[PDB]
Design a protein around this ligand. Sequence first.
Ligand SMILES: CC(C)NC(=O)c1ccc2ccccc2n1
Ligand SMILES: [Cl-]
Ligand SMILES: [Cl-]
Length: 182
Amino acid sequence: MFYGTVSSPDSGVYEMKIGSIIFQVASGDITKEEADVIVNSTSNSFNLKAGVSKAILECAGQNVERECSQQAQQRKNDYIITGGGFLRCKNIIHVIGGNDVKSSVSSVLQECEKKNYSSICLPAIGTGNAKQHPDKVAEAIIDAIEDFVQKGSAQSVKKVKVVIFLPQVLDVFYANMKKREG
Ligand SMILES: CC(C)NC(=O)c1ccc2ccccc2n1
Ligand SMILES: [Cl-]
Ligand SMILES: [Cl-]
């Protein structure tokens, strides 16, 4: 009902349509990307500095670190939204790596529609310190996007890209795309 064809538009990038959204995967350093929103996969304290979270907090800078710990003490949050700091984005959405990945991605998509944003870049959420299995993480990310499209919710969001630290995890995402393709 939804899936287009898998192709490679640029070296190391793989893409397919999911309804009106372009879904892409690539390996690399997510802190070098430009998008309306970049997603961080962190702890329930929003102060982890290991793996992807280390790179994101160090690049973003100390004002973003302090925004995080200020919101964490105010209430119990499933995720938090901060400024971009010195990353090339309008906002960072910090999700909890150990939480249900489909739920986390659904929340990111909803928040981006609320701001009329068009582009999102995320890591392989949960595959770092949280040690969720890559096969289950890929299935959950793509399922969230399918559900969002099926419900008629995609209006401003046009591009969702997963930038993945390890090439071996990229292989798992590409196999999942080929399983789904029209
Ligand atoms: C070798 C291993 C311990 N490093 C990591 O897990 C890791 C993850 C994401 C990164 C993003 C930018 C830069 C370095 C990064 N390193
Ligand atoms: Cl994680
Ligand atoms: Cl990753």
